[PDB]
Ligand binder design. Structure first.
Ligand SMILES: [Cl-]
Ligand SMILES: [Cl-]
Lengths: 363, 351
């Protein structure tokens, strides 16, 4: 049964996930491996996420460093697992998104797959989003088909919910097509605030949020954002959720304590998920939570509250650690590419139809 | 007998070349197609070849336009030839280079291969240079292996010379492995000068050059470069000596290219019976005169004489490179590129 590596750096950017799966009758996780990303690499990536000078050269240099790190992680994992590269059929590389502009019909992942193949000695499948975009799609999210393969059940209406930077839900309804969409903010505003305020990369354990007090007025002005009304195919904020967007809202209201702002941001995520989810699937029996936000104890409470009809739990309860779900999916996408099975869900992305996603860079 | 399309921007960025080959026991050219490149697109590509603002967004939009054009040409060619896309195994896409810095270990060719796959319904193999550069190579030139496969001969010592911007040669000597290097400027300076002077893209048939007179003081100053190439570099050399007629500089520029070719080529392959010229410089009658004289003991002619039109050489090589990818055969000559060893070049974007 073939083995794959999945390689990603998400939108949180503290490091690189590497997973090893076996794709037999089902997808089995064999091993996991996390590397820290140097702070400099994280900032240089974030410096490419907004328009700037000399981007071609800058991106090429950044991408060399990102690939070097990935290959390093792959080497460490294989050695530690007593495995040779020849035991791995392919790497599925998510790359690093520096610009996602589906409305301008483009998405940009860097991560020089050719150099990744050179360094690793393993075939690499990368560049998964662009075929979806070329076919009129949003290029995202790409995890629903994997989610469906993992948790596709006729006996239960399930929502698979990834809380990364942004929140995306896969709606698995018995006797129906797979639906899904980015619900909006996950950790990203909470990351942005504690970063601006104190220089921390994220709010660990949602602790600083926990200390604060939700501001019902500010929350109402955030949830007032028209974005939430937008339905159907949607990816990574139809209103780019950022700190300039937040600060604009803050000034209008009275001066609030930072901790309260953090508590409000937490409630915003909880609320926007609940309502974007139940609106599309009121029948939801189970919410399977993955991504970093699955660790946020407070956030996980509020989801359970706001969705009383559904059982809300980490994917750990269904035998898949939440930290590794996205990487496992990119390993799976490498499999789908090699088998010429469709990677996208056209009803999720809004593409014209099913497509083979990715490109093969052979070792 | 698989069939492949080869795609690339043409000479002087005035259009796109598309070729259809059959890869049997040898490479056969079935058909050729040329599409003009809009002036906007040409200038927008050139505006990305130097560092500037908002490149990632600008490059995304330019490559959408470039891929739309390529696909338009593919469609035109296939209908005109009464062929289905299902008859073509793959497109080999050269893409469009906007930045080539092997010194900094990168090379950047745009051309959204997935969009091309989407629009043509044909598998695309692209991004040929990056694996060679990943392996410590220069990522160029990639045609030596093709030239060997095409015009390899046991009896004749050949030089296959491509005169694009720069003049790269493939030295085909019986019994020996293929060699290659850049002989200095091809059309790059001659295009740059008439562009600066008159806003023309190129000097057609080297007519303007042929109206002028060579300047020794300049020619010698130019040939004194330790390489033995751009507009500022030329104007620096111009400013030393006194005012000179534009046609004479253009004449001088033409001779610089001829001499650097003649001298470098004969230096590396003294026993050169035949020089097979291809690319845009092949149609520079004036330059082809001088080359014949400055290499008197060799037969100097375009690849037309040996069965393949000089215009389509490069496109045919990229179709060939799609073949090498799918067969998992090496596409580089690591002795020419400086790569660590043989590598399969490119990446497959399936329809
Ligand atoms: Cl995704
Ligand atoms: Cl080349």
């Amino acid at each position: 049964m073939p083995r794959y590596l999945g390689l990603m750096s998400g939108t949180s950017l503290d490091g690189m996930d590497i997973v090893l799966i076996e794709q037999g009758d089902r997808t089995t996780l064999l091993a996991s491996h996390y590397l820290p990303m140097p702070a400099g690499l994280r900032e240089d990536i974030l410096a490419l996420c907004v328009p700037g000078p000399d981007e071609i050269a800058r991106a090429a240099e950044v991408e060399q460093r990102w690939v070097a790190l990935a290959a390093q992680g792959v080497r460490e994992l294989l050695l530690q697992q007593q495995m040779s590269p020849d035991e791995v059929r392919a790497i599925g590389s998510h790359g690093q998104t520096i610009r996602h502009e589906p409305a301008r019909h483009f998405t940009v992942q860097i991560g020089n797959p050719a150099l990744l193949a050179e360094l690793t000695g393993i075939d690499v499948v990368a560049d998964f989003r662009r075929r979806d975009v070329a076919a009129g799609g949003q290029g995202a999210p790409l995890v629903p088909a994997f989610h469906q393969a993992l948790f596709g059940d006729d006996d239960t209406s399930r929502a698979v919910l990834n809380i990364g930077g942004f929140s995306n839900v896969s709606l698995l309804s018995p006797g129906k097509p797979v639906r899904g969409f980015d619900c909006g903010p996950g950790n990203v505003l909470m990351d942005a605030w504690i970063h601006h305020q104190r220089g921390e990369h994220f709010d660990r354990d949602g602790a600083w949020a926990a200390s604060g007090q939700v501001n019902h007025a500010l929350l109402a002005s955030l949830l007032a954002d028209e974005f939430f009304a937008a339905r159907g195919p949607k990816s990574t904020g139809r209103e780019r959720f950022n700190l300039p967007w937040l600060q604009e809202h803050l000034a209008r209201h009275p001066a609030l304590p930072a901790a309260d702002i953090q508590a409000t941001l937490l409630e915003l995520s909880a609320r926007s998920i609940s309502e974007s989810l139940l609106d599309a699937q009121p029948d939801c029996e189970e919410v399977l939570v993955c991504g970093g936000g699955a660790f946020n104890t407070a956030l996980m409470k509020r989801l359970a509250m706001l969705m009383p009809e559904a059982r809300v739990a980490s994917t750990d309860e269904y035998g898949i650690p939440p930290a590794w779900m996205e990487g496992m999916a990119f390993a799976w996408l490498a499999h789908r590419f090699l088998e010429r099975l469709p990677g996208n869900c056209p009803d999720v992305t809004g593409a014209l139809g099913p497509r083979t996603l990715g490109a093969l860079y052979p070792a």
